[PDB]
Design a protein around this ligand. Structure first.
Ligand SMILES: *[C@@H]1O[C@H](CO)[C@@H](O[C@@H]2O[C@H](CO)[C@@H](O)[C@H](O)[C@H]2NC(C)=O)[C@H](O)[C@H]1NC(C)=O
Length: 459
């Protein structure tokens, strides 16, 4: 912890807000998804109410204040602000609401960090192809412009798209998020393409239209699992684990932070294999030469969201097999003496290695951890000393990264002010620094030991 370092906790519109059809709000895709049932969400839970944050925002403020956060990361509800997705119909109640969060945040001396989009397309926009249609690029840019215009007089730190990588894979490649149709090996790259251009244009709208007057900074956040060779000094695995990084992280960061084009490994591997089943073209779409000039250097800081490490081994696509992006000839798993809670294997030395990697691959950028954290399964909590130790270690290696490795880290943001709707997991996993009880109509917030113990770290 150097400089005037920022400590923050993130929330996300759909995961905490409720009021899904309150005050003019248009349906978003999770509204349609969770209302459909099937066993897509744990127990068919919805975010109709979630933490009730659209109604109990001062409760959130109280927690923020109690933590003494220097910053606070939340997202804007695209369909709360623009019910049909466009500026053709503006919801003043949505505007009043985010205006209040921001104003309250500034009067308590806390700096807002605003995600424009967090896995939550307006239903209207998804009906028109979602991130599969390039029509989306213009849609997002106009929405982004609207957000800068309305909130930018006093918001100076923006994340445009939250985890576009996790988004393209879960929404369109794996079919796990809405719109929930599988598409193994085509969906993800097809979305990723549009998410890259849409982020890119949105950045250029900000640089052109608001940056002079507003003086803020803008990027997008990326999910990074840090990867290690299953067996080390076993040569194949060594390059496999590197290649799997370029596939999940650099597929987005190379174009945006460097040179404006996909990584070379990626282009060759997908193309080659697309000859495969006799696709008439690669499944990695192509950036035009014009596009590359638009996309490059289109980020004001590097923003990662870290949670875990994995071990990776080589796995030849002996008999070509569809995409799953994995069929870039990798297989992943944990080293067997790691602690877990669902998907998050507690490997805190991973962020340090991840942070020098970023410094090494992206010319020493300013970095924010815009999400880091650990969940607990329904009952475990309050005196969550197990979990808090996990946090301690993570900060310990964070210290090492700044000191020994000289990484330009300026923000640590913890994933999560509140226990909330964790997508398919529903309320069955709890990443909050503050417990929330979803059974009483109030939605009371009580600190975890972590909450109290994170306040101290904010030295
Ligand atoms: C989640 O909601 C779905 C509805 O989409 C439930 O589906 C029902 O499943 C039961 C058997 O478990 C069937 O008898 C019903 O016919 C199904 N409902 C309909 C109308 O399709 C599902 O049971 C729910 N699961 C949980 C765990 O709550």
């Amino acid at each position: 912890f150097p400089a005037g370092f920022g400590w923050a906790a993130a929330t996300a519109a759909y995961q905490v807000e409720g009021g899904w059809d309150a005050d003019g709000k248009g349906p978003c895709v999770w509204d349609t998804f969770t209302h459909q049932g099937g066993e897509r969400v744990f127990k068919n839970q919805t975010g109709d109410v979630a933490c009730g944050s659209y109604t109990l925002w001062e409760e959130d403020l109280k927690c923020i204040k109690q933590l003494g956060l220097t910053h606070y990361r939340f997202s804007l509800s695209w369909s709360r602000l623009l019910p049909d997705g466009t500026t053709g119909f503006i919801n003043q109640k949505g505007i009043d609401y985010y205006n209040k969060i921001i104003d309250d945040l500034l009067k308590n001396g806390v700096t807002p960090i605003v995600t424009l989009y967090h896995f939550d397309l307006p239903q209207t926009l998804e009906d028109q192809g979602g991130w599969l249609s390039e029509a989306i690029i213009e849609s997002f840019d106009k929405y982004a412009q609207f957000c800068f215009s309305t909130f930018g007089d006093r918001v100076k730190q923006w994340i445009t798209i939250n985890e576009a990588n996790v988004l393209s894979v879960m929404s369109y490649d794996l079919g796990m998020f809405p719109p929930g149709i599988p598409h193994f090996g085509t969906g993800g790259y097809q979305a990723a393409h549009n998410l890259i251009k849409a982020h890119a244009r949105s950045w250029h709208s900000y640089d052109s239209l608001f940056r002079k007057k507003q003086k803020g900074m803008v990027s997008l956040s990326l999910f990074a699992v840090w990867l290690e060779p299953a067996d080390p000094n076993s040569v194949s695995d060594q390059e496999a684990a590197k290649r799997a990084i370029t596939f999940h992280l650099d597929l987005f960061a190379k174009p945006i932070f460097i040179d404006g084009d996909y990584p070379e490994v990626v282009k060759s591997q997908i193309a080659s294999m697309s000859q495969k089943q006799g696709y008439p073209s690669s499944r990695l779409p192509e950036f035009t030469e014009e596009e590359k000039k638009m996309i490059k250097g289109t980020a004001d800081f590097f923003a990662v969201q870290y949670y875990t490490t994995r071990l990776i081994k080589y796995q030849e696509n002996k008999k070509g097999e569809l995409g799953i992006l994995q069929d870039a000839e990798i297989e992943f798993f944990p080293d067997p003496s790691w602690i877990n809670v669902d998907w998050i294997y507690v490997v805190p030395w991973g962020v340090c290695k991840l942070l020098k990697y970023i410094k090494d691959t992206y010319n020493n950028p300013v970095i924010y951890i815009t999400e880091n954290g650990f969940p607990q399964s329904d009952p475990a909590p309050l005196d969550d000393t197990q979990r808090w130790e996990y946090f301690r270690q993570t900060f310990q290696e964070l210290f090492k990264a700044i000191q020994l490795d000289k990484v330009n880290l300026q923000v640590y943001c913890a994933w999560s002010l509140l226990d909330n709707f964790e997508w398919n997991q529903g309320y069955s996993s709890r990443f909050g620094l503050f417990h929330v009880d979803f059974e009483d109509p109030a939605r009371p917030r009580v600190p975890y030991t972590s909450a109290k113990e994170y306040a101290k770290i904010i030295r």
